[PDB]
Amino acid sequence: PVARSWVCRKTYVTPRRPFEKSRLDQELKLIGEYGLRNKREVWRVKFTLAKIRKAARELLTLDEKDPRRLFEGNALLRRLVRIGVLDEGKMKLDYILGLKIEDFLERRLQTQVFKLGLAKSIHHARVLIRQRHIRVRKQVVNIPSFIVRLDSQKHIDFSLRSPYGGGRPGRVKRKNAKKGQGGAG
Amino acid sequence: SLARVGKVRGQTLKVAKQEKKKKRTGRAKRRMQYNRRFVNVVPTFGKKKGPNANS
Amino acid sequence: MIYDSLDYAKKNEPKHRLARHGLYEKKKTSRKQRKERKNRMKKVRGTAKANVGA
Amino acid sequence: GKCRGLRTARKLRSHRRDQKWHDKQYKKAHLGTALKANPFGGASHAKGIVLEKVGVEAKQPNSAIRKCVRVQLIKNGKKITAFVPNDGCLNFIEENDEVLVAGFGRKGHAVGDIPGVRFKVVKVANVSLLALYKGKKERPR
RNA sequence: GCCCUAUCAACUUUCGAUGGUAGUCGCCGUGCCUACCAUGGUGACCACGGGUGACGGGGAAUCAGGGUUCGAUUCCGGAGAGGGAGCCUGAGAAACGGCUACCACAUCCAAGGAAGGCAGCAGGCGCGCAAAUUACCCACUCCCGACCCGGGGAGGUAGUGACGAAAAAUAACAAUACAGGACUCUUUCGAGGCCCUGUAAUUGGAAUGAGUCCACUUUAAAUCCUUUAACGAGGAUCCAUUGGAGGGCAAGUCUGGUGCCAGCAGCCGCGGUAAUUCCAGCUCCAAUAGCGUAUAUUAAAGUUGCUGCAGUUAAAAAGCUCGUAGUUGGA
Ligand SMILES: [Mg+2]
Ligand SMILES: [Mg+2]
Ligand SMILES: [Mg+2]
Ligand SMILES: [Mg+2]
Ligand SMILES: [Mg+2]
Ligand SMILES: [Mg+2]
Ligand SMILES: [Mg+2]
Ligand SMILES: [Mg+2]
Ligand SMILES: [Mg+2]
Ligand SMILES: [Mg+2]
Ligand SMILES: [Mg+2]
Ligand SMILES: [Mg+2]
Ligand SMILES: [Mg+2]
Ligand SMILES: [Mg+2]
Ligand SMILES: [Mg+2]
Ligand SMILES: [Mg+2]
Ligand SMILES: [Mg+2]
Ligand SMILES: [Mg+2]
Ligand SMILES: [Mg+2]
Ligand SMILES: [Mg+2]
Ligand SMILES: [Mg+2]
Ligand SMILES: [Mg+2]
Ligand SMILES: [Mg+2]
Ligand SMILES: [Mg+2]
Numbered sequence: 171p172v173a174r175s176w177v178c179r180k181t182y183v184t185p186r187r188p189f190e191k192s193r194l195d196q197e198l199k200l201i202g203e204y205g206l207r208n209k210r211e212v213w214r215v216k217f218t219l220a221k222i223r224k225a226a227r228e229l230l231t232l233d234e235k236d237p238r239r240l241f242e243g244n245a246l247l248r249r250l251v252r253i254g255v256l257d258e259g260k261m262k263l264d265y266i267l268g269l270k271i272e273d274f275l276e277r278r279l280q281t282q283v284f285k286l287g288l289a290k291s292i293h294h295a296r297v298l299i300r301q302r303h304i305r306v307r308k309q310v311v312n313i314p315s316f317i318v319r320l321d322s323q324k325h326i327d328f329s330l331r332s333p334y335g336g337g338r339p340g341r342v343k344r345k346n347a348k349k350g351q352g353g354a355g
Numbered sequence: 356s357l358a359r360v361g362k363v364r365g366q367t368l369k370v371a372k373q374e375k376k377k378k379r380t381g382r383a384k385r386r387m388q389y390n391r392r393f394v395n396v397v398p399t400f401g402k403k404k405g406p407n408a409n410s
Numbered sequence: 411m412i413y414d415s416l417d418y419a420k421k422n423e424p425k426h427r428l429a430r431h432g433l434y435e436k437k438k439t440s441r442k443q444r445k446e447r448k449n450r451m452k453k454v455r456g457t458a459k460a461n462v463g464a
Numbered sequence: 465g466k467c468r469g470l471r472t473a474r475k476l477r478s479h480r481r482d483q484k485w486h487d488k489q490y491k492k493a494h495l496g497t498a499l500k501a502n503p504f505g506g507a508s509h510a511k512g513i514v515l516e517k518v519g520v521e522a523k524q525p526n527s528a529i530r531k532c533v534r535v536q537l538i539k540n541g542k543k544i545t546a547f548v549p550n551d552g553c554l555n556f557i558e559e560n561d562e563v564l565v566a567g568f569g570r571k572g573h574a575v576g577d578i579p580g581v582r583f584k585v586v587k588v589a590n591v592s593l594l595a596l597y598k599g600k601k602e603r604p605r
Numbered sequence: 606g607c608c609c610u611a612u613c614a615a616c617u618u619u620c621g622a623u624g625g626u627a628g629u630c631g632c633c634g635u636g637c638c639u640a641c642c643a644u645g646g647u648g649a650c651c652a653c654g655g656g657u658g659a660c661g662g663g664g665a666a667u668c669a670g671g672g673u674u675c676g677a678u679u680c681c682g683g684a685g686a687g688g689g690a691g692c693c694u695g696a697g698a699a700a701c702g703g704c705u706a707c708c709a710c711a712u713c714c715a716a717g718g719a720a721g722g723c724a725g726c727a728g729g730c731g732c733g734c735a736a737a738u739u740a741c742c743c744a745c746u747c748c749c750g751a752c753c754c755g756g757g758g759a760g761g762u763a764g765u766g767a768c769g770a771a772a773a774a775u776a777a778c779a780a781u782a783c784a785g786g787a788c789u790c791u792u793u794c795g796a797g798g799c800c801c802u803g804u805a806a807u808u809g810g811a812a813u814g815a816g817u818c819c820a821c822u823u824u825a826a827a828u829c830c831u832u833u834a835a836c837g838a839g840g841a842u843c844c845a846u847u848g849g850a851g852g853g854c855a856a857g858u859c860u861g862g863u864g865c866c867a868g869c870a871g872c873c874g875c876g877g878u879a880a881u882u883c884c885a886g887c888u889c890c891a892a893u894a895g896c897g898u899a900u901a902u903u904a905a906a907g908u909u910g911c912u913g914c915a916g917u918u919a920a921a922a923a924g925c926u927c928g929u930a931g932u933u934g935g936a
Contacts, residue, residue, distance in 0.1 A: 171679055171759080171760080172679065172760090172761095173746080173760095173761095174679090176679090178769080178770040178771075179770080179771090180770070180771095181770090181771080188854080188855090188891090189854050189855055189891080190855095191854095191855075194855075194891085198388070198389060198392065199389075199393065201385055201389065202385070202386065202388075202389025202390075202392075202393070205382065205386075206382065206385070207381060207382040207385070207773090207774095207893095208385075208892085208893065209892080210893095290777080290778065291777080291778080293382070293386065293776090293777070294777055294778075294812095296382070296776095296777095297776070297777050297812075297813080298777095298812085300773095300774075300776095300812095300813070300814080301812060301813045301814080302813080302814095303812080303813090312773090313772075313773080315772080315773095333811085333812065333813085334810075334811080334812095356519070356529050356866085357517070357518075357519045357529065357531070357554075359866065359867060360531075360552050360554050360555055360867080361551065361552030361555060361867075362552075362863075362866070362867045362868095363551070363862080363863055363866085363867050363868075363883075363884050364551050364552060364867080364868095364884050364885090365552065365867090365884095366862085366863075366867095366884090367861095367862060367863080367884050367885055368861070368862055368884095368885075368886095369885080370861085370885070370886055371886090372885095372886070372887095373886075373887075376806070376840075377840090377842095377844055377845090378845090379775090379776085380775065380845060380893085381774075381775060381776080381845095381893090382776095383775090383776070390802090390803075390804090394802065394803090395784095395785065395786090395802060395803065395804090396785080397785085397786085405856065405857075405889085406856075406857095406889070406890090407850080407856065407857045407859090407888065407889045407890085408857065408858095409857065409858095409859050409888080410857080410858070410859085424744075424825090425825095426744060426824095426825045426826095427825095429825095436825090440741085440742090441741090441742070441743090442741095465910080465911065465913090465914095467932075467933095468911090469932060469933065470933095471932080472931095472932060472933095473911095474650075474651095475931085475932075476911070478651095480909070480910095480911095481609090483909070484909065486909090487908095487909070490909090493901090493902090494609095495609065495610095495656095495657085499658075504734090504900090506658080506900090506901085507734065507735090507900075507901095508734065508899055508900035508901080509734035509735090509899075509900085510734070511733090511734075525865085525874090525875095526865075526875095526876090527865050527866090527876095527877095528865075528866075528867080528868075528876095530868090538733090539732095539733080550868085551867065551868055551869095551883090551884075552867080552868090564734075565734095566734090566898075566899045566900090567899055567900065568871095568899080569871065569898080569899065569900095570871070571900085575870095575871080576870070576871090576872095577870095584898095584899090586898080586899080
């Protein structure tokens with residue numbers, strides 16, 4: 171009689187044929203390029219795109235002036251424009267069908283860290299966002315699966331640096347009484 | 356027969372295993388794999404071997 | 411909340427919070443030694459209920 | 465189909481309802497006495513007690529003597545030929561112990577070269593056999 | 606408006622079965638039951654009788670469209686407190702954390718007698734392939750009462766917890782030690798670089814937590830998380846396994862042993878003195894904090910076929926006509 175939720179859902183589809191030779195290549199360039207840690211993030215993105223496409227391929231099944239299609243396709247294009255993939259001049263529900271995987275990977279924040287030149291490499295990115303060195307719009311960010319608010323913003327808010335001066339004691343204050351007073355003098 | 360039990364494993368030549376550097380894991384393994392496939396090497400001549408083809 | 415009156419505190423404020431500042435002593439016996447005191451005070455009818463506990 | 469009327473439903477359904485009984489996977493799994501005569505009784509594992517160690521020849525091109533263990537079960541009292549998978553792991557099994565038998569994997573059917581042996585061995589005396597074989601664990605002495 | 610069976614085809618009826626009349630009981634309507642008369646009622650459109658590892662429905666998993674299988678389990682509605690019958694108080698109970706007896710199981714005894722029911726929360730015994738703390742509290746949501754004020758193992762918070770599901774570490778860079786290339790060249794080689802990729806256990810001081818943990822905070826009392834001071838890693842030893850490398854199916858004709866022996870292998874297949882398949886080294890792969898092995902199962906299965914199967918020789922049309930139900934019937 172407890173008061174809980176009981177609601178979860180998987181978000182990655184293992185494929186059907188396991189050992190195609192050509193898929194492991196394209197699904198290796200989509201790892202070595204955007205600096206990923208496994209294949210689940212790939213399957214997770216392709217399934218979120220399949221959800222977008224299959225809903226659109228249910229609405230294009232409908233005639234014009236469908237009161238359902240008007241509300242749903244028009245708020246769908248709002249949900250894609252505000253994550254900034256389609257051109258806002260191109261509010262027209264035929265360009266959804268020409269939408270590849272890279273339209274979300276380019277909008278990952280790990281690439282906008284590489285492209286905004288606020289880093290060195292791509293693999294230096296995940297170590298930044300691990301080490302609490304950035305923020306977005308005065309809100310600290312810890313995750314490279316955070317495409318959010320396409321109108322974006324940079325770092326930092328407030329962080330006082332002292333990692334090695336507040337490290338080894340200036341490299342000065344250690345040699346006072348260590349093997350010096352108790353030996354020769 | 357039931358009286359030849361454990362002949363070969365009992366009578367192989369036991370050699371100690373080696374002791375070397377650990378293999379990088381995580382994304383760094385995937386990165387080294389990306390590094391040995393596309394961006395640096397070219398198809399040189401004739402067929403393409405396997406990556407273990409010590410022949 | 412409000413700052414209105416010192417005396418409305420004990421009137422419309424729960425007693426776990428008055429004792430943050432400190433105005434309310436609680437009990438010192440748990441509920442396991444209260445239920446067994448109660449049931450041992452349920453076997454007997456008469457004056458001597460007060461006679462058997464603790 | 466062969467009849468195609470508008471109100472011929474009790475002919476179709478009382479024809480399919482008979483001709484389903486001539487399937488093999490429907491008759492073995494669904495109602496019938498296969499779940500009755502399963503030595504496990506419709507489950508995936510069973511404990512047992514060893515009574516003897518025997519070997520079985522192999523069939524054609526092959527020529528060997530595979531190793532098998534006659535087991536009597538707990539929950540019924542029947543008798544099973546098991547199988548000792550790995551090399552030389554017969555020498556870790558002593559008489560009158562308990563073994564945990566798992567089905568082989570072709571759904572109660574003869575496999576490979578071994579004539580009529582359904583079931584295999586997973587654990588011995590509550591010690592996992594891959595560790596007793598490798599060396600991570602040791603028999604409780 | 607329902608699951609399997611014709612190796613269940615005829616059933617019910619002075620033992621109320623189907624109806625008429627007058628009554629009794631009961632909250633009211635009736636064979637619910639007595640008294641008197643009549644002989645009828647269901648059934649191949651599957652009655653009757655038997656099974657069910659059957660609790661029913663809201664719904665869950667896979668799915669083109671059709672559908673198959675699962676719904677013991679937090680919501681609604683019924684049934685039952687070892688088995689069966691009986692009854693009090695009370696608006697309302699055939700109640701069991703209420704009583705009266707039998708049968709089965711069972712306690713204390715001075716041997717005269719007495720008392721009991723976990724399929725309530727915890728926890729043991731047992732059976733098993735198979736499933737957690739004899740902890741804390743009325744503060745939250747709510748319920749009971751004579752009632753602002755006392756209670757509630759209903760309930761809540763913690764402990765166990767790899768059923769499963771989401772997010773996410775195990776490194777990042779720079780200098781020149783070696784190769785490779787479009788770019789300038791030079792008849793090639795070299796070199797020259799508006800841009801390098803990197804490769805070695807090469808060297809450099811970077812940038813942090815896991816952990817350690819004062820102090821708040823959180824909470825009825827505490828804890829985790831969250832915020833922070835001091836602390837805290839270069840083979841950063843603060844170290845990633847599980848399976849496999851004949852084909853199907855990604856990937857060694859590498860080396861050393863046994864020599865149809867021991868063994869692998871879901872299937873074809875390997876082993877008899879040079880084994881790419883065995884036991885081991887080296888190397889190599891796929892998934893990664895997860896992976897294999899069993900079993901139940903759905904898709905693939907147009908190999909159960911209404912959409913959508915076959916019947917000359919492969920499995921397959923009664924030896925032949927007649928014929929009541931049934932199914933379908935010209936303008
Ligand atoms: Mg493949
Ligand atoms: Mg048809
Ligand atoms: Mg065979
Ligand atoms: Mg029900
Ligand atoms: Mg279909
Ligand atoms: Mg089906
Ligand atoms: Mg109810
Ligand atoms: Mg009674
Ligand atoms: Mg009752
Ligand atoms: Mg009671
Ligand atoms: Mg009892
Ligand atoms: Mg029960
Ligand atoms: Mg109360
Ligand atoms: Mg309760
Ligand atoms: Mg936990
Ligand atoms: Mg916290
Ligand atoms: Mg295998
Ligand atoms: Mg191997
Ligand atoms: Mg395989
Ligand atoms: Mg199946
Ligand atoms: Mg066929
Ligand atoms: Mg024939
Ligand atoms: Mg004939
Ligand atoms: Mg004949």
